[PDB]
């Protein structure tokens, strides 16, 4: 069923071929310095990271709201994330998919790097999932389908995403997913070795320092679907080391309310053996798209956003952040001296 090569597969191939053409053009000549800090009114912090924060901002000349990520160059350097940050910006300005947040502008000043992305007012999947407890399987399937198509797109461009988790998935006004946080995304043919990701979501080969490829994204999809449907991840503990021990052990247990189709899909995604992991076989992503758990999924209708979403986030006008947690605010300071110019010259 997942091996067949009828007309439907050639439509996907044609689509992906054109997508790659567009991507490569932008990949080879990245947009650079397309706005300035003073063009935006900074409103409120939407999230934080080790070397920066994302703020809600309003573009003064259009009155559009955006999510501006502000990264402190010195902090990036200290955490050895220079090349990863260059990856992020180069990749994000090049890609285009219905479930990928768009990078609208980027620029830098003496102190910071700036990435101005679409604002997604529905908040993080993480917030909704924790509050409601768990999603129904139809609800989880809906979101899962979008990630499947997104990884199909990303992987065809030789990209690996490497940080799938509910914290990194936003819900837009139509109730669809927007993937953000490209901090660990990388364009690589063959294999790579960087230890990165989030402990709950790491594939065994990452933990064992094996060298790895896009199959780690499909493992992470397994973890995501489990957590969405269960309300907790398949491997959790108080300390990361114990998480890693569970992950490499080869043992996974499922809630008794998991359908047999769901458990079967998850056993093939949470497969420690790469020669057996779904997404990594001869049939590629089609082993996943044709799995019984996705029988009701109309992939085209999903892509076209014609499917009715499980829920629509509360929307109290534009600029409303009620779907986001509050964070401590800090004044943006721009040094009178250029920091780390050489390191980020191509940004």
């Amino acid at each position: 069923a997942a091996a067949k090569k009828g007309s439907e597969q050639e439509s996907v191939k044609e689509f992906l071929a054109k997508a790659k053409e567009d991507f490569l053009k932008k990949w080879e000549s990245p947009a650079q310095n397309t706005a300035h800090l003073d063009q935006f009114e900074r409103i409120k912090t939407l999230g934080t990271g080790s070397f920066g924060r994302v703020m809600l901002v309003k573009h003064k000349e259009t009155g559009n709201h955006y999510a501006m990520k502000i990264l402190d160059k010195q902090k990036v350097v200290k955490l050895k994330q220079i090349e990863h940050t260059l990856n992020e910006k180069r990749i994000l300005q090049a890609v285009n998919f219905p479930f990928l947040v768009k990078l609208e502008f980027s620029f830098k000043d003496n102190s910071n790097l700036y990435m101005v992305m679409e604002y997604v007012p529905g908040g993080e999947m993480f917030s909704h999932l924790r509050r409601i407890g768990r999603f129904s399987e139809p609800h989880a399937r809906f979101y899962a389908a979008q990630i499947v198509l997104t990884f199909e797109y990303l992987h065809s461009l030789d990209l690996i995403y490497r940080d799938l988790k509910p914290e990194n998935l936003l819900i837009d006004q139509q109730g669809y997913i927007q993937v953000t946080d490209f901090g660990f995304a990388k364009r690589v043919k063959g294999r790579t070795w960087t230890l990165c990701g989030t402990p709950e979501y790491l594939a065994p080969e990452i933990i064992l320092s094996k060298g790895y490829n896009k199959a780690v994204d499909w493992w992470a999809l397994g973890v995501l679907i489990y957590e969405m449907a269960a309300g907790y991840p398949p491997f959790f503990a108080d300390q990361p080391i114990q998480i890693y021990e569970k992950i490499v052990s080869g043992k996974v247990r499922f809630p008794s309310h998991f359908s047999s189709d769901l458990k079967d899909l998850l056993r093939n995604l949470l497969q420690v053996d790469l020669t057996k992991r779904f997404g990594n076989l001869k049939n590629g992503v089609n082993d996943i798209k044709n799995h019984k758990w996705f029988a009701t999924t109309d992939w085209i209708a999903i892509y076209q956003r014609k499917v009715e979403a499980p829920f629509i986030p509360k929307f109290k006008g534009p600029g409303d952040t009620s779907n986001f947690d509050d964070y401590e605010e800090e004044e943006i300071r721009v040094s009178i001296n250029e920091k780390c110019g050489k390191e980020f010259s191509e940004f």
Binding site: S50, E167, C196, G197, T198, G231, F236, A237, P240
Partner: peptide, 20 residues
């Protein structure tokens, strides 16, 4: 229950990435 064990754990908040 597994759910109760999760909820009482220290990892139900936002999880930080690793990279060392």
């Amino acid at each position: 229950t597994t759910y109760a064990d999760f909820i009482a754990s220290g990892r139900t908040g936002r999880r930080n990435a690793i990279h060392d």
